[PDB]
Amino acid sequence: MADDPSAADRNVEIWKIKKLIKSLEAARGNGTSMISLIIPPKDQISRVAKMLADEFGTASNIKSRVNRLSVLGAITSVQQRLKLYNKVPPNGLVVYCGTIVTEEGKEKKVNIDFEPFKPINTSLYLCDNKFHTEALTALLSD
Protein backbone atom coordinates (compact mmCIF):
# COMPACT_ATOMS: atom_id res chain seq x y z
CA MET A 1 0.00 0.00 0.00
CA ALA A 2 0.92 3.69 -0.16
CA ASP A 3 2.78 5.43 2.67
CA ASP A 4 0.90 8.71 2.15
CA PRO A 5 -0.97 10.23 5.14
CA SER A 6 -4.20 9.99 3.14
CA ALA A 7 -4.08 10.20 -0.65
CA ALA A 8 -7.10 8.40 -2.10
CA ASP A 9 -8.50 8.38 1.44
CA ARG A 10 -8.84 12.17 1.31
CA ASN A 11 -11.74 11.53 -1.08
CA VAL A 12 -13.37 8.90 1.12
CA GLU A 13 -13.25 11.33 4.03
CA ILE A 14 -14.93 13.97 1.88
CA TRP A 15 -17.69 11.40 1.38
CA LYS A 16 -18.25 10.86 5.10
CA ILE A 17 -17.66 14.50 5.97
CA LYS A 18 -20.14 15.47 3.26
CA LYS A 19 -22.78 13.28 4.90
CA LEU A 20 -21.57 14.18 8.40
CA ILE A 21 -21.94 17.95 8.01
CA LYS A 22 -25.49 17.55 6.69
CA SER A 23 -26.48 15.60 9.80
CA LEU A 24 -25.24 18.51 11.91
CA GLU A 25 -26.99 21.19 9.84
CA ALA A 26 -30.28 19.47 10.67
CA ALA A 27 -29.44 19.33 14.38
CA ARG A 28 -30.87 22.21 16.42
CA GLY A 29 -31.14 22.68 20.17
CA ASN A 30 -32.69 25.20 22.55
CA GLY A 31 -30.67 28.35 23.19
CA THR A 32 -27.34 26.50 22.81
CA SER A 33 -27.30 22.71 22.54
CA MET A 34 -24.49 22.39 20.00
CA ILE A 35 -20.83 22.42 21.00
CA SER A 36 -18.19 22.64 18.29
CA LEU A 37 -14.61 21.88 19.31
CA ILE A 38 -11.56 21.84 17.04
CA ILE A 39 -8.07 21.00 18.34
CA PRO A 40 -4.74 21.44 16.47
CA PRO A 41 -2.82 18.34 15.26
CA LYS A 42 0.18 19.12 17.47
CA ASP A 43 -2.09 20.10 20.37
CA GLN A 44 -2.88 17.67 23.19
CA ILE A 45 -6.30 16.29 24.09
CA SER A 46 -5.83 16.99 27.80
CA ARG A 47 -4.81 20.51 26.77
CA VAL A 48 -8.31 21.40 25.59
CA ALA A 49 -9.54 19.96 28.89
CA LYS A 50 -8.31 23.19 30.46
CA MET A 51 -10.10 25.39 27.94
CA LEU A 52 -13.24 23.27 28.15
CA ALA A 53 -13.12 22.83 31.93
CA ASP A 54 -12.92 26.62 32.06
CA GLU A 55 -16.23 27.10 30.27
CA PHE A 56 -17.67 24.09 32.10
CA GLY A 57 -17.24 25.74 35.48
CA THR A 58 -18.34 29.18 34.30
CA ALA A 59 -21.34 27.61 32.57
CA SER A 60 -22.72 26.70 35.99
CA ASN A 61 -22.51 30.39 36.92
CA ILE A 62 -24.88 31.50 34.16
CA LYS A 63 -27.90 33.53 35.28
CA SER A 64 -30.20 31.47 33.07
CA ARG A 65 -31.23 28.18 34.68
CA VAL A 66 -32.21 26.37 31.48
CA ASN A 67 -29.14 27.81 29.76
CA ARG A 68 -26.61 26.97 32.48
CA LEU A 69 -27.85 23.38 32.38
CA SER A 70 -27.82 23.05 28.59
CA VAL A 71 -24.22 24.27 28.64
CA LEU A 72 -22.88 21.87 31.28
CA GLY A 73 -24.62 19.04 29.46
CA ALA A 74 -22.87 19.52 26.13
CA ILE A 75 -19.50 20.30 27.70
CA THR A 76 -19.79 17.17 29.85
CA SER A 77 -20.15 15.25 26.59
CA VAL A 78 -17.17 16.91 24.89
CA GLN A 79 -14.71 15.94 27.63
CA GLN A 80 -16.34 12.51 27.72
CA ARG A 81 -15.05 12.08 24.18
CA LEU A 82 -11.64 13.47 25.14
CA LYS A 83 -11.11 10.53 27.50
CA LEU A 84 -11.47 8.36 24.40
CA TYR A 85 -8.55 10.12 22.69
CA ASN A 86 -5.13 10.04 24.36
CA LYS A 87 -3.85 12.51 21.76
CA VAL A 88 -5.00 14.54 18.75
CA PRO A 89 -5.09 12.67 15.38
CA PRO A 90 -2.34 13.33 12.78
CA ASN A 91 -4.51 16.03 11.21
CA GLY A 92 -6.31 17.21 14.34
CA LEU A 93 -9.10 16.51 16.81
CA VAL A 94 -12.66 17.74 16.29
CA VAL A 95 -15.58 16.46 18.36
CA TYR A 96 -19.20 17.64 18.37
CA CYS A 97 -21.49 17.15 21.35
CA GLY A 98 -24.97 18.57 21.81
CA THR A 99 -28.62 17.90 22.63
CA ILE A 100 -31.12 18.26 19.79
CA VAL A 101 -34.84 17.55 19.36
CA THR A 102 -36.69 15.36 16.88
CA GLU A 103 -40.06 15.93 15.21
CA GLU A 104 -41.40 13.29 17.58
CA GLY A 105 -40.49 15.63 20.44
CA LYS A 106 -37.79 13.35 21.81
CA GLU A 107 -34.45 14.87 22.81
CA LYS A 108 -31.49 12.98 21.35
CA LYS A 109 -27.90 13.96 22.11
CA VAL A 110 -25.43 14.08 19.23
CA ASN A 111 -21.89 13.04 20.16
CA ILE A 112 -19.36 12.73 17.33
CA ASP A 113 -15.56 12.58 17.40
CA PHE A 114 -13.13 12.52 14.48
CA GLU A 115 -10.08 14.09 12.83
CA PRO A 116 -10.44 17.06 10.42
CA PHE A 117 -10.10 16.73 6.64
CA LYS A 118 -6.61 18.20 6.86
CA PRO A 119 -4.12 19.61 9.43
CA ILE A 120 -5.50 22.64 11.28
CA ASN A 121 -3.19 24.94 13.25
CA THR A 122 -6.09 26.72 14.98
CA SER A 123 -8.13 25.49 17.96
CA LEU A 124 -11.74 26.52 17.39
CA TYR A 125 -14.26 26.12 20.24
CA LEU A 126 -17.80 27.55 20.23
CA CYS A 127 -21.29 26.86 21.55
CA ASP A 128 -24.41 27.81 19.59
CA ASN A 129 -27.76 26.62 18.24
CA LYS A 130 -25.86 24.86 15.43
CA PHE A 131 -22.54 23.08 14.90
CA HIS A 132 -19.95 25.31 13.21
CA THR A 133 -18.65 23.32 10.24
CA GLU A 134 -16.48 26.22 9.08
CA ALA A 135 -13.28 24.29 9.80
CA LEU A 136 -14.75 21.34 7.90
CA THR A 137 -16.17 23.38 5.03
CA ALA A 138 -12.92 25.37 4.99
CA LEU A 139 -11.26 22.75 2.79
CA LEU A 140 -14.12 22.48 0.29
CA SER A 141 -14.61 26.25 0.46
CA ASP A 142 -10.88 26.87 0.10
Q: What is the largest CA-CA distance in the chain?
A: 56
Task: Determine the Cα–Cα distance for residues 138 and 132; give it in Å rounded to an integer.
Answer: 11
1-142 — its CATH code? 3.30.960.10
At residue 135's C-alpha, the angle toward residues 133 and 138, to 5°, is 100
**What ranges make up the beta strands (E) of 15-76?**
34-39
Task: Determine the Cα–Cα distance for residues 113 and 31; give it in Å rounded to an integer.
Answer: 23
Task: Determine the Cα–Cα distance for residues 75 and 78; give it in Å rounded to an integer.
Answer: 5
Radius of gyration of the chain (CA): 16
Q: How far is CA 7 from CA 1, 40, 138, 141, in A?
A: 11, 20, 18, 19
